[PDB]
């Protein structure tokens, strides 16, 4: 019947594959997959095994995601699946040259490879994405943080982790799928049936993040066939929106990586106007310095609607939003004797919102208040920071008297926003409040004048406040009026 990996799957678009050599005569991909003249490998059916399978995962007639998709093959990996960063750069330059020659259309570059962090390789992925190319990469199979690998750590690419038939992260001995804040989502990557290079009609079962990345590249090609004018920012938000939620048991991931790793498994639901799409981005850990700073930015074509912070020990000095390069950035502050903090941003697709920060200095009275007053402006997030070591109406941000309050005011006449709260007197470990159905979470914070708060972060449409008066989780929920 239909293989398990295709259960969640329901025009001038090219899919470039930078892999090993492929067996183009295979019945699954023949006529649709073109072999380019490109070859740059460090030095016969085992040579074609990896590339043939992945071409079959993307555009396979029987076992493919995007059945009958047009592909173009480049050889950057030898017979043993080994390549170089330099050989990969020349392959990416070959695509840029081909993009200028071939007719204008959506380009998908599948990079089912991984090396260590490479500055030149991530800069090359940045150059292509600025030219309108959708890059889909593998997270790696090292049971490690994908931020240490390239092109997985490139902010402009779509990094894909691997899950099995039970939606659990893939384990292969002492190894398995990579994880972390650099991963966008997960996709089927274990026991994946596809084209075998042994015979022209043979099938083989393979596993890895390469199979998971080929699955997402298949979904992206189907999205770009129906809507050829989709940007990378619009395409990334849809992959997140269409994903299966909370189906991965996070216990497989290390404890410090559970909050950073997205619990998303790739899907393509039945098709079925403008709606608000938001996602969470995590900054790198700031460090043990008392004056260290964690900075979280949003992707180009995206708007930062809120900023939050988190510390595993709770020794922090809050966060703030500030204008930098004509856009808002999330900046978290570490306390004196703190191990470091994370800056957590809320990245949304809200065109021409021109979000501005409105700050009220610490009033030091009975507390600190600020609101959005402009015409057609809505409150999307509340941030607060304090310079002290130890502290002692709707459409409004409320902070501690010794702290400076910040409000994100976005010009969006089509949005209606509301505040939803939930308080617990003696919290065990966390306080939770979620937005209702049809609503999109834009901001997650905690009420001040509280004993011990580790931090706050948004997980999909749920505001999560970490704890160690009732501790209250405050959620700002927005939606389109239609």
């Amino acid at each position, epitope marked *: *019947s239909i293989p398990w990996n295709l259960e969640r799957i329901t025009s001038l678009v090219e899919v470039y594959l930078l892999d090993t050599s492929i067996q183009s*005569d295979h019945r*699954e991909i023949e006529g649709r997959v073109m072999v380019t003249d490109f070859e740059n490998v460090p030095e016969a059916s085992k040579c074609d095994s990896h590339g043939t399978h992945l071409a079959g995962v993307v555009s396979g*007639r*029987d076992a493919g995601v995007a059945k009958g998709a047009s592909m173009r093959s480049l050889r950057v990996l030898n017979c043993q699946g080994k390549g170089t960063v330099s050989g990969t750069l020349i392959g990416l330059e070959f695509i840029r040259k081909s993009q200028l020659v071939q007719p204008v259309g959506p380009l998908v570059v599948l990079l089912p490879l991984a090396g260590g962090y490479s500055r030149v390789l991530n800069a090359a992925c940045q150059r292509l994405a600025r030219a309108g190319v959708v890059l889909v990469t593998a997270a790696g199979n090292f049971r490690d943080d994908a931020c240490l690998y390239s092109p997985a750590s490139a902010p402009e690419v779509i990094t894909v982790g691997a899950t099995n038939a039970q939606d659990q992260p893939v384990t292969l001995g002492t190894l398995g799928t990579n994880f972390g804040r650099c991963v966008d989502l997960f996709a089927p990557g274990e026991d994946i049936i596809g084209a075998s290079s042994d015979c*022209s009609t043979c099938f083989v079962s393979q596993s890895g993040t390469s199979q998971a990345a080929a699955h997402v590249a298949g979904i992206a090609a189907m999205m770009l066939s129906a809507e050829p004018e989709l940007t990378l920012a619009e395409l990334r938000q849809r992959l997140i929106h269409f994903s299966a939620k909370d189906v991965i048991n996070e216990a497989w991931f290390p404890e410090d990586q559970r909050v950073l790793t997205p619990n998303l498994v790739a899907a393509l639901p039945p098709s079925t106007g403008w709606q608000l799409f938001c996602r969470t981005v995590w900054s790198a850990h700031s460090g043990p310095t008392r004056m260290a700073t964690a900075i979280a930015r949003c992707a180009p074509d995206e708007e930062l609607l809120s900023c939050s912070s988190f510390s595993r020990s709770g020794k922090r000095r809050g966060e703030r939003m500030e204008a930098q390069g004509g856009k808002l950035v999330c900046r978290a502050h570490n306390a004196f004797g703190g191990e470091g903090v994370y800056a957590i941003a809320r990245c949304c697709l809200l065109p021409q919102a021109n979000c501005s920060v409105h700050t009220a200095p610490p009033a030091e009275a009975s507390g600190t208040r600020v609101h959005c007053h402009q015409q057609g402006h809505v409150l999307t997030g509340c941030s607060s920071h304090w310079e002290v070591e130890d502290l002692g109406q709707p459409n409004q941000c409320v902070g501690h008297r010794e702290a400076s309050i910040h409000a994100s005011c976005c010009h969006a006449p089509g949005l209606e926003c509301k505040v939803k709260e939930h308080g617990i007197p003696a919290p065990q470990e966390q306080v939770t409040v979620a937005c209702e159905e049809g609503w999109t979470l834009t901001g997650c914070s905690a009420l001040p004048g509280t004993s011990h708060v580790l931090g706050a972060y948004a997980v999909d449409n749920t505001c999560v406040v970490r704890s160690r008066e009732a501790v209250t989780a405050v959620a700002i929920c927005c939606r389109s009026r239609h």
Partner: antibody, heavy 118, light 109 residues
Framework: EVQLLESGGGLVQPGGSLRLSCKAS????????MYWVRQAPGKGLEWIGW????????KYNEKFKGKATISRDNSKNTLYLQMNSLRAEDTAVYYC???????????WGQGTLVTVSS | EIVLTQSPATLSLSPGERATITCRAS??????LNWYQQKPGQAPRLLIY???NRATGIPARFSGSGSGTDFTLTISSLEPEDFAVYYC??????????FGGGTKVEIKR
């Protein structure tokens, strides 16, 4: 039209060898793969070997390794078979079949009976 | 290796009645399965290719179905010349070809 003319059938002494041919016509002989398949009466289809008339590349069934040999002559579009040290279990109707790479067996021989008896 | 299991071994039906023969692959083979018909004293004849396509010169009563592991050969109305032996066939790697065991279709009186 595509025709596959077989020859070399008859009686073989036990311990002796069968020597069959398959003359092909109506197509470019190198563009298609060739097989030797046999069938004992009442039993099913048992493949013997394969050859690529372009490369000369061959494959054989493990049960016939060392006993079976397949060769070709592209100048006369003829396929060849030799199966040594025959026993009474080797009595079967032998076929030569053309394969369309990755598709099917489109053309067959008429069927050649080989009986092994002393 | 792939093993093709055919069910049943012998199918006894009356002329005009519908016939269904099953071929089961031990592994995923996609839709690259072929059906052959063999009448006595004759070589096998290509009937269905790519699990659903009728071969050139095959009557419309013959139809194939399936993808993956389960395959079905269907004869809408049994004509008296349709009572023969049927074989399913796929390609593989270690042995380059795999044939089914065979299914004999018998007239029922």
């Amino acid at each position: 039209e595509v025709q596959l003319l077989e020859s070399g059938g008859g009686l073989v002494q036990p311990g002796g060898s069968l020597r069959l041919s398959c003359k092909a016509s109506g197509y470019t002989f190198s563009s298609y793969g060739m097989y030797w398949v046999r069938q004992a009466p009442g039993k099913g289809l048992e493949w013997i070997g394969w050859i690529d008339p372009g490369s000369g590349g061959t494959k054989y069934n493990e049960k016939f390794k060392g006993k079976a040999t397949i060769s070709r002559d592209n100048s006369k579009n003829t396929l060849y078979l030799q199966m040594n040290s025959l026993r009474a279990e080797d009595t079967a109707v032998y076929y030569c079949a053309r394969e369309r790479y990755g598709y099917y067996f489109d053309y067959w021989g008429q069927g050649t009976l080989v009986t092994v008896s002393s | 290796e792939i093993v093709l299991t055919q069910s049943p071994a012998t199918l006894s039906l009356s002329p005009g009645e519908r016939a269904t023969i099953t071929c089961r692959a031990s592994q995923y083979v996609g839709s690259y399965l072929n059906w052959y018909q063999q009448k006595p004293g004759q070589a096998p004849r290509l009937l269905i290719y790519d699990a659903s396509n009728r071969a050139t010169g095959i009557p419309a009563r013959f139809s194939g179905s399936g993808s993956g592991t389960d395959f079905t050969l269907t004869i809408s109305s049994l004509e008296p010349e349709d009572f023969a032996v049927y074989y399913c066939q796929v390609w593989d790697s270690s042995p380059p070809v795999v044939f089914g065991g065979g299914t004999k279709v018998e007239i029922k009186r």
